[PDB]
Amino acid sequence: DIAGLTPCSESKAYAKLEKKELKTLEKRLKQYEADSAPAVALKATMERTKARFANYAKAGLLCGNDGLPHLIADPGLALKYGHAGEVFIPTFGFLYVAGYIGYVGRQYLIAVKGEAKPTDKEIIIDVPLATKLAWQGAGWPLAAVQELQRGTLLEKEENITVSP
Amino acid sequence: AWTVPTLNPDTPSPIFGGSTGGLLRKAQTEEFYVITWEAKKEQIFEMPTGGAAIMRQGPNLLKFGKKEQCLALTTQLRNKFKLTPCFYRVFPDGKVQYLHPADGVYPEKVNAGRVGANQNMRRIGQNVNPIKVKFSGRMMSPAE
Amino acid sequence: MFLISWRGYWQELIETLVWAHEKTPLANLVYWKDKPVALSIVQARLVGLAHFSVGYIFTYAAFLIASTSGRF
Amino acid sequence: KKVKIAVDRNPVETSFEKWAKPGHFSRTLSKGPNTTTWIWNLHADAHDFDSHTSDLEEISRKVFSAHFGQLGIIFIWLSGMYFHGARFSNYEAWLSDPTHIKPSAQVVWPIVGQEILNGDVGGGFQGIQITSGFFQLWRASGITSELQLYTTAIGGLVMAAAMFFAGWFHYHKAAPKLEWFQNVESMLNHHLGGLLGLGSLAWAGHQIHVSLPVNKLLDAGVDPKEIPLPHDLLLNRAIMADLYPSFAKGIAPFFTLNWSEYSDFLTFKGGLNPVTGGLWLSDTAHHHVAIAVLFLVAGHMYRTNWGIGHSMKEILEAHRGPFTGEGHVGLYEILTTSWHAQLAINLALFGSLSIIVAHHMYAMPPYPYLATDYGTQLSLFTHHTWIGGFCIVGAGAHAAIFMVRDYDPTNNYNNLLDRVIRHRDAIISHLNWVCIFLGFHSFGLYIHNDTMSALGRPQDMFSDTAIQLQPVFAQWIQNTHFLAPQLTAPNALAATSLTWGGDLVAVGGKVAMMPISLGTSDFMVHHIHAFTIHVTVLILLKGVLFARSSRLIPDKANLGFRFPCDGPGRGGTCQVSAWDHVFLGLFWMYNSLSIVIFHFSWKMQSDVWGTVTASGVSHITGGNFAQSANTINGWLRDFLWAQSSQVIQSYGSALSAYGLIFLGAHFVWAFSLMFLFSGRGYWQELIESIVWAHNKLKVAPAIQPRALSITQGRAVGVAHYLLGGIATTWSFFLARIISVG
Amino acid sequence: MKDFTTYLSTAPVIATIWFTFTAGLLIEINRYFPDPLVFSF
Amino acid sequence: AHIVKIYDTCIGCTQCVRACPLDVLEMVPWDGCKASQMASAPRTEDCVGCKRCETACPTDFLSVRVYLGSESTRSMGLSY
Amino acid sequence: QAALYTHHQYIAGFIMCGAFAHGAIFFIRDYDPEQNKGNVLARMLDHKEALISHLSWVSLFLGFHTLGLYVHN
Amino acid sequence: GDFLVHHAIALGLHTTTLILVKGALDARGSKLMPDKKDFGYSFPCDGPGRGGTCDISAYDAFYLAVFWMLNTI
Ligand code: CLA
Ligand code: CLA
Ligand code: CLA
Ligand code: CLA
Ligand code: CLA
Ligand SMILES: CCCCCCCCCCCCO[C@H]1O[C@H](CO)[C@@H](O[C@H]2O[C@H](CO)[C@@H](O)[C@H](O)[C@H]2O)[C@H](O)[C@H]1O
Ligand SMILES: CC1=C(C/C=C(\C)CCC[C@H](C)CCC[C@H](C)CCCC(C)C)C(=O)c2ccccc2C1=O
């Protein structure tokens, strides 16, 4: 109960919709023998389903008027009420991987311009070079903020313009 | 030595059975452009108005309705066959005007005696702004 | 039609219509004053955007008025 | 021997050295990129074999081994469907109850919840209900076991590696010379006799000795594990004489010309097999026998190494008349030194064959339990009309490429081809008129019916209870071809189909095929079809005949086939090239074929398909075609809105993938309008503004970002228009017809 | 086969190997971790 | 009558004249280049403005330059 | 209520895009750089790629993560 | 549902301004065409040269936004 909401372990339309889905799976399950793999598959679907509802209520996800897990994307309402795993943890779990791919792709382009013809090595990726920058870019925020302090991250007004 | 050749319409046409892409009623009111060349040997060229006509030895007279239809004929008569044509401009009052080797020499090569019109003794990046050429009577490009 | 087809497919099509008008018997009595040319490039933007926008507006306004007042 | 084997030993070293250098085929590409237009021109010019080199022999060797690459991929594709027919299917269960068990041969993996796409297709099985109708091929082939599907899947992998070997061998190791390919007399004698003739002789022998005794035992009713295996149907003549009692006479009635004694298993029944809904297989057996004797006879027509037989240079040059000057002189020389001139004639008829195939298979369903499967019937029609329609536009594209590249004005003087160009203004303008005539007098009938029905004047519409425009001629042919076994085809037991009239075939409580009555709504929509095809002809033929020159641009062939324009001059010259006419024709082919498959999918559901109760048979949509196809609003209400209620609420079911692609292709269609409307010089400047922010953070790429080319942004646009357009109708049709049929 | 490894190191081949890597990694994780809507512990 | 005005960044490689499909352009002597020549447009009455000239100029920020003005019966490219 | 809202939204939509249209006509027909040395209007044209690339980031971020959430749903 | 659609409105507002502010700023020229001010506001193109310049003008940069405007509204 943060913004008119309720815990999904406490709401009833959530549990009503769980019983709605398991009803649809079981009336689909009835057409098969109890040994048959079209019934082994559906009972494995249920145990993935029933554990999914158990795990969403375990994490304390917020339901509402429709009985669905609602997310809270604000720190200070997720840090305070124990919901940083909804948005506030994957907003840095993403931005680690995002700037990682950016930094590896940056370092591959920076370390290819001092060559004979760098356009050839954007077709033919230097795999012993590219994987070497791939592994060693794992501390990229530790390397970027040191490059941020110099002035070597931002190229100056050598950049190309039209008519300022 | 060279000056302004005239025309006789007596010169034979290429053997061409006629196309529907030929002249129009503009030839009878505004203008139509006739083209002459001197062919060495009998061979088969393409009409710019679709099809194929065969040229005959000596002079060859042909007529079109556009200027590009004549110059896209000389382009395949000079580059392919190394002939030297010239096309004119005929008005329906009988007046004729000489057009393409207008000083004898073809325009890709210098004649040293043709006058350099429509030039700017300045760089294209040094045009003025359109605020300066505003209210020039009519609408006017800043390159004037 | 004014957005996907552009001008120069249409100017060639009009050149056949000019031919078929200037060679048709008993329609050569009739001749135009302004020469038929295809709509220019900037015009085709405007005419196509106008047909896009009028048909956009009349579609939704028909759906807006009749879905509201149909049940109300 | 003028007709002789002529190859060249080892023209190309088999080496990976040229895979290291992309763009090696062309001079303009082998120097590496400096611009992202390089990697698009790499894939665009890749199979443009006429543009790589000038040597016609080197072109011919490239297209000969690329055809083994296409055949080798088809053999992988066929062997996939037999393998997915074998290991992941219900073809074992389907044969015992082919009325209730839905055909299914694709099974998905249970990972993200996508196992819900494994529907309850029956037969103790879960999987995607397929619609490609392989199970109806296989009952017609008498497969009866998943062992047979597995052995012909391994036979497909073996054949694909043989085809990959053959293209490797006939290019790299021993590649033919030019005059091998220019024996078109020897190619047609071999392809009419050996491919088409001996192929249909061999398949008839499969139908005599395998499929007829298997499917006679299935129709008489035998469980498929109890039927004799088809090699026992060869080694034992006494088994075959039990089913068809004329195998006991052996092959003596053939050589003694007592062919009437083969009347048990080569028949002329006609109509349909009422047990199974399909055509009679003994009818299709006498078909492929008589097809084979026809093509083997026609395969001995042309002259190769002995003086008998015709020569195609003399055949063409003799057929000349007083209206056409030289006649067909010079067409042999351009159909032998130009592949595009071949490819245009080939894609025309091969595309036109596909539409013949589509119309001749709903009406005469050749496979057992094909007609009652309404999902297979809708897909096999719709697919084979589109595959036809693309190939017909490919005829217009590669005929234009002939006019630009391989056309010779020298050798073409006053033949047919020269005289078509010389009156190309009369061709297009009389075609321009008849498109405008068909425009008003077909679609304006719909606007008339819309207006009269909206103005409360239903007696002034064009319908059956109103101003009646009957299809008199097509209703006359249905009165003749149904009465054709009376005296014009006296040896037919029934009609050639059931569309012409008669009674229906009830299989499994569903209509296999009932007669089709044509009305004023069928009149208007057939003239819609005549309209959209004539406009598609208009655009493509304008691109062919004005490929080289016009009154607009006289030097157009010097600019080439695929160029954008000649600039903004002379009013503007956007889309003047012959590429651009087959750009615009794809929309009209899309426009023509959508109305073909809409007129199929609603005439059948209103007037053919549906469940039979022997109590006043009811159709799927209730019988509302002639009642409602007068108006555009009838196509809006009763077809695109009423039948869309199985693709929009199909979530939580196996048809929910079709609901996604229904939104998926509604996206990709509209995504194309970003490309079809906008232009390059916008998007290049926007790239400059974001190269600037990539210059600023030192991530400027070396292969420099450019906007897509003028012809490319059009080609991206029509490709996403067709992909988003067709896959909309794909998912609309299949989510409709799998549920209600 | 050095020229063959250049082909394996071109742009679309590394793209179709790395995308089978990255999808195939996320497919195996989404098998052994069924339906991660929220970061648990 | 279109407005074709060329500039001093011309080098006189005369590719614009060879590309002009209407003989708008010709080559005049001028000392500001090695080839001793600079183009000129004495026939802009005949120009359509199809800009085949400035597809062909090698110089950065094209030396020849076509301004689409008012269109007569010769500028619209009309046989009629 | 349905008509009066939808009317003055499309009327607002056309008027707002004409503000930028006649704003773009300003830079061609009326702008004078010698008159506008260094003011806030010329600094707009000075860092004009920073404007367009940061709009192109916001538009691209929103389109990725609004459509991507609807397709996920 | 109202979270997602206001961001979609925000998408449509930021993208319509992206097209228009680019049409204002690049009305005087780009690197593709550094003298766009010499032609004027509403011109067709600058030919097929320099890679092709369909829809290069600031008019043609304004008209693309009307599609993204009618989308947004
Ligand atoms: C027998 C069939 C056949 C054959 C052999 C050819 C052969 C050729 N065509 Mg042709 N064509 C055909 C059918 C055929 N065509 C048909 C049916 C059409 C009508 C659609 C055309 C329309 C056409 C045009 C308009 C052009 C050609 C061109 C060419 C030449 C080069 C093609 C190339 O390198 O592209 C290499 C291959 C590609 C670039 C692939 C294209 C990508 C497609 C469009 C995407 C669709 C794939 C799939 C269906 C979508 C799902 C994929 C999924 C990942 C989403 C070559 C001579 C070109 C030419 O000669 O240039 C002068 C040319 O401009 N053709
Ligand atoms: C009677 C002999 C015969 C037969 C059966 C064929 C059959 C074929 N030819 Mg063909 N051809 C022949 C003689 C023959 N040709 C002669 C004499 C010439 C020279 C004038 C050519 C020149 C020629 C060209 C230039 C092309 C073909 C192509 C084709 C294929 C058409 C593709 C198709 O529709 O799929 C039908 C597919 C099948 C029926 C699958 C079975 C395939 C069989 C096993 C291979 C064909 C039999 C082979 C010719 C016999 C030699 C066996 C080999 C081991 C030596 C098809 C495989 C086209 C093709 O696809 O290229 C590869 C093509 O481009 N042929
Ligand atoms: C629904 C949209 C639409 C419509 C109506 C048209 C209409 C037309 N297209 Mg077309 N086109 C479209 C979309 C459309 N196109 C698209 C999206 C493309 C993109 C690829 C093209 C590409 C295209 C090409 C490439 C070609 C056409 C052609 C044609 C014409 C042939 C039909 C004809 O003459 O019938 C007559 C007109 C109609 C049926 C429209 C309805 C009019 C009704 C029936 C009566 C008229 C009203 C009446 C006079 C009252 C007026 C009121 C008064 C106040 C003025 C016609 C002008 C072809 C052409 O011009 O040559 C024939 C042609 O070559 N179009
Ligand atoms: C206060 C309002 C206002 C004023 C005074 C102007 C004034 C001007 N504008 Mg501007 N403009 C405005 C609002 C305004 N605009 C808005 C709101 C937009 C965005 C939609 C634009 C977009 C715009 C552009 C893009 C251009 C101008 C141009 C011009 C100038 C030329 C006028 C012109 O072309 O008219 C003539 C107008 C017409 C002939 C109307 C064309 C047809 C329209 C779309 C109406 C179609 C409606 C349709 C027929 C509905 C009937 C459907 C039927 C079924 C019932 C002039 C200074 C031009 C300029 O200065 O060039 C440099 C120019 O290029 N304006
Ligand atoms: C439904 C149609 C549609 C769509 C999707 C777009 C989308 C876009 N337009 Mg728009 N546009 C359209 C119609 C459309 N437009 C029309 C009709 C016009 C009038 C001509 C315009 C005119 C226009 C202009 C003038 C501008 C845009 C811009 C943009 C971009 C906005 C940024 C954004 O949201 O990025 C998000 C994009 C997406 C979510 C689409 C990507 C889809 C997925 C994520 C890609 C990956 C999926 C999958 C892996 C790919 C499969 C391919 C293969 C593997 C099989 C975006 C690409 C602006 C721009 O460039 O901003 C950066 C811009 O300046 N457009
Ligand atoms: C590719 C060459 C073209 C010709 C096709 C040949 C395909 C190979 C088929 C071999 C299969 C055996 O075929 C043949 O076996 C037996 C031997 O005559 C025949 O069987 C018959 O002859 C036996 C002895 O005469 C007796 O049991 C019976 O008369 C009867 O069973 C079959 O009627 C025939 O099918
Ligand atoms: C949007 C658009 C563009 C912009 C489209 C850009 C230039 C290309 C789109 C993205 C391309 C496909 C690059 C993306 C993939 C690259 C291979 C980079 C891959 C990197 C990772 C994704 C692996 C045009 O260039 C254009 C040109 C002419 C008319 C209309 C338009 C048009 O509408």
Query: Which domains are present in chain E?
Result: 1-41 (1.20.5.510)
Smallest Cα distance from G53 to chain H, Å = 9
Q: How far is CA G18 from CA D278, H13, H44, in A?
A: 65, 14, 19
State the sign of the Cα–Cα–Cα–Cα dihedral C43, C47, C52, C54. Answer: positive
Question: Does A163 contact H at CB distance below 8 Å?
Answer: yes
CB distance D670 to ligand 5 below 6 Å: yes
Q: How many residues does chain F have?
A: 80
Q: Is the CB of D68 under 6 A from ligand 2?
A: yes
Question: Any idea where the domains of chain B sit in the sequence?
Answer: 1-144
DSSP string, F22-59: T---EEEE-SSSTT-EEEE-TTTTS------STTT--S
Which ligand 1 atom sits nearest the alpha carbon of residue D711?
64
Tell me the residue type at D520. Answer: T
D511: CA distance to ligand 4 center in Å? 60
| Nearest Cα residue in chain D from E35 | D112
CA of C33 to the centre of ligand 4 (A): 28
Q: What is the DSSP string of D150-215?
A: HHHHHHHHHHHHHHHHHHHIIIIIEEE-HHHHT-HHHHHHHIIIIIIIHHHHHHHHHIIIIIHHHH
What's the rounded Cα separation, in Å, for the pair H63 and G51? 20
Q: In this complex, is the C-beta atom of B131 within 8 Å of any C-beta atom belonging to chain G? A: yes
> Which of D573, D575, D572, D582 has its CA nearest to residue D543?
D582
Cα D286 to Cα D262: distance, rounded to the nearest angstrom: 10
**CB distance D406 to D334 below 8 Å:** yes
Tell me the C-alpha to C-alpha distance, in Å, between residue F57 and each of D77, D241, H36, H43. Answer: 51, 85, 18, 21
* DSSP class per residue in D580-633: HHHHHHHHHHHHHHHHHHHHHHHHHHHHT-SB--SSS---SS-S-STTTTTSHH
D682 by DSSP, 3-state: which? helix
- The sign of the CA dihedral B15, B21, B26, B32 is negative
Nearest CA in chain G to C56: G10
Q: Is G20 on the interface with C (CB under 8 A)?
A: no
Q: How far apart are CA D383 and CA D380, in angstroms?
A: 5
Tell me the C-alpha distance between D645 and D665, whole Å: 17
For chain D, after which residues does the C atom lie more than 2.5 Å from the next written residue's N, i.e. where is it broken? none
Query: What are the distances in angstroms from CA D562 to CA B143, D557, D558, F54?
Result: 34, 10, 11, 20
Q: How many domains does one find in chain A?
A: 1
Q: How many CB atoms lie within 10 A of CB D194?
A: 13
**A160 touches D: beta carbon within 8 Å:** yes
The gap between the terminal CA atoms of chain E, to the nearest Å, is 48
In three-state secondary structure terms, D334 is helix
SS3 D298: helix
Contact at CB, E6 and A125, closer than 8 angstroms: no
Ranges assigned E (strand) in D661-733: none
What are the C-alpha distances in Å from D546 to residues D403, D443, D560? 9, 29, 12
How many angstroms separate the CA atoms of G31 and D384, rounded?
60
Q: Which residues does ligand 7 sit against, CB inside 6 Å? A: D 674-675, 678-680, 683, 707-708, 713; E 15
d(CA D502, CA D658): 37
Return the sign of the alpha-carbon dihedral for residues D93, D98, D100, D101.
positive
Query: Is F75 close to D568, i.e. CB distance below 8 A?
Result: no
Residue with tokens 């302090």: A149
Which atom of ligand 6 lies closest to the CA of D231?
Answer: 11
Closest-CA distance of chain D to residue F2, Å: 10
* Domain, as residue range, for A120: 1-164
Burial of C30 (C-beta count, 10 Å sphere; 0-12/13-18/19+): exposed
Nearest-angstrom CA–CA distance, D161 and A33: 42
How far is the C-alpha of A52 from the C-alpha of A156, rounded, in Å? 52
Residues written for chain E: 41
Q: What DSSP string runs through B48-86?
A: TTSS-EEE-SEEEEEEESSSHHHHHHHHHHHTTT----E
Give, in order, the Cα–Cα distances in Å from H42 to each of A162, C45, D212, H46, H52: 20, 11, 74, 12, 17
The kind and range of the H/E element at D353 are helix D339-362
What is the sign, positive or negative, of the torsion defined by CA atoms of D76, D81, D84, D86? Answer: negative
D236 lines ligand 6 (CB under 6 A): yes
| Cβ-contact C41, D568 below 8 angstroms | yes
H41 lines ligand 4 (CB under 6 A): yes
Reduced to 3 states (helix: H, G, I; strand: E, B; else coil), residue A6 is: strand
Of F52, F78, F79, the CB nearest to D567: F52
Q: Which fold has domain D1-741?
A: Photosystem I p700 chlorophyll A apoprotein A1 (1.20.1130)
| Cross-chain Cβ contact H44/C41 below 8 Å | yes
Chain F: partners with 3+ C-beta pairs within 8 Å: B, C, D, H
Interface test with chain D among A159, A160, A162, A163, by most D beta carbons within 10 Å: A159
Angle at CA D732, nearest 5°, toward D729 and D734?
Answer: 105
Cβ-based neighbour number of residue D145 at 10 Å: 17
Please name which ligand lies nearest the alpha carbon of E12: 7
Count of CB contacts below 8 A, D vs H?
75
- Interface touch G50/D686, C-beta < 8 Å: no
Sign of CA dihedral D446, D451, D456, D461: negative
Of A112, A155, G44, the closest CA to residue D694 belongs to A155
- Phi, psi (rounded to 5 degrees) for D127: 175, 175
In chain G, the N- to C-terminal Cα span, in Å, equals: 31
What's the token pair of residue D548?
């080289």
Q: How far does chain C reach from its first CA to its final CA, in angstroms? A: 38
Taking the centre of ligand 6 as the mean of its atom positions, its distance from the CA of residue D237, in whole angstroms, is 8
Instruction: For residue D686, give the ligand 7 atom closest to its CA.
Output: 4
Distance between CA atoms of D495 and D489, rounded to whole angstroms? Answer: 9
SS3 D384: helix
Residue type, G2: A
Chain H residues within 8 A of G71 when measuring between CB atoms: none
CB B69 within 8 Å of CB B48? yes
User: Is B123 within 8 Å of chain F by CB?
Assistant: yes
Structure token pair of residue F31: 């000392």
CB contact under 8 A, F28 and B115: yes
* Cα angle: D312, vertex D316, D319; to 5 degrees: 140
Q: What is the DSSP string of chain H?
A: -HHHHHHHHHHHHHHHHHHHHHHHHTTS--SS-TTHHHH-SS---S-S-TT--TT-SHHHHHHHHHHHHHHH-
CATH, residue A153: 1.10.8.110
As a whole number of angstroms, the distance between CA B50 and CA B58 comes to: 23
Ligand nearest to the CA of H53: 7
Q: Which long-range contacts (CB under 8 A, 24 or more apart) does D254-257 make?
A: none
Q: How many helices (H) and strands (E) does chain G have?
A: 3, 0
**Residue D680 C-alpha to ligand 7 middle, in angstroms?**
11
Q: How much of chain B is in helix, strand and coil states, percent to nearest 5?
A: 10, 25, 65
Contact (CB<8Å) C60/G6: yes
Q: Is G17 in the pocket of ligand 4 (CB under 6 A)?
A: yes
Chain C CB contacts of D587 below 8 Å: 4
| Spatial separation of the C-alpha atoms in residues D404 and D398, rounded to whole Å | 10
Q: Of the candidates D356, D345, D346, which has an alpha carbon nearest to the alpha carbon of residue D384? A: D356
**Method by which the model was determined:** cryo-EM
**Which ligand has the minimum distance to the alpha carbon of residue D189?**
2
Do residue A161 and residue G49 have CB atoms under 8 angstroms apart?
A: yes
* Resolution as reported, in Å: 3.3
Give how far D7 is from chain G: nearest CA, Å.
56
What residue type is D52 in one-letter code?
Answer: H
Chains that touch H (3 or more CB pairs under 8 A): A, B, C, D, F, G
Task: Check D570 against F50: CB less than 8 A apart.
Answer: yes
Residue of F23, F37, F40 lying closest to B119 (CB–CB): F40
Q: Which two tokens stand for residue D664?
A: 């998926």
Tell me the ligand closest to D431's alpha carbon: 3
- The count of other CB atoms within 10 Å of the CB of residue D319 is 12
* H44 neighbourhood in chain D, CB within 8 Å: 568, 572
Chain E residues touching residue A69 (CB < 8 angstroms): 37-38
Chain D partners within 8 Å of C20 (Cβ): 425-426, 429-430, 432-433
B142 and H34 in contact by Cβ < 8 A?
no
Rounded Cα distance between A28 and D652, Å, is: 12
The Cα of A164 is separated from the nearest Cα of chain G by a number of Å equal to: 4
Contact C16, D427 (CB under 8 A): no
Residues D412 and B50: their CA atoms lie apart, in Å, by 12
D298, D194 contact by CB (below 8 A): no
Ligand 3, residue D531: give the atom nearest the CA: 32
Q: Which of the other chains make 3 or more beta carbon contacts under 8 angstroms with chain D?
A: A, B, C, E, F, G, H
Residue D422 sits at the vertex; the CA angle it makes with D416 and D426, to the nearest 5 degrees, is 105
Whether residue B108 lies within 8 A of chain F, CB to CB, comes out as yes
User: Is some CB atom of chain A closer than 8 A to the CB atom of H31?
Assistant: yes
Domain boundaries B1-144, corresponding CATH code = 3.30.1470.10
Which amino acid makes up residue F50? Answer: C
Q: What is the DSSP letter of D500?
A: S
Structure tokens at D727: 């896959």
Sort out which chain D residues have CB atoms less than 8 A from G49's CB and list them.
688-689, 692-693
Q: Give SS3 for A3.
A: coil
Which chain A residue shows the shortest CA-CA distance from G38?
A164
Q: What span, in angstroms and rounded, lies between the C-alpha atoms of H18 and H5?
A: 19
What chain F holds in terms of domains, given with CATH numbers, is 1-80 (3.30.70.20)
Q: Cα–Cα distance between B75 and B78 in angstroms, integer?
A: 5
Asked if residues D281 and D215 have their Cβ atoms less than 8 Å apart, the reply is yes
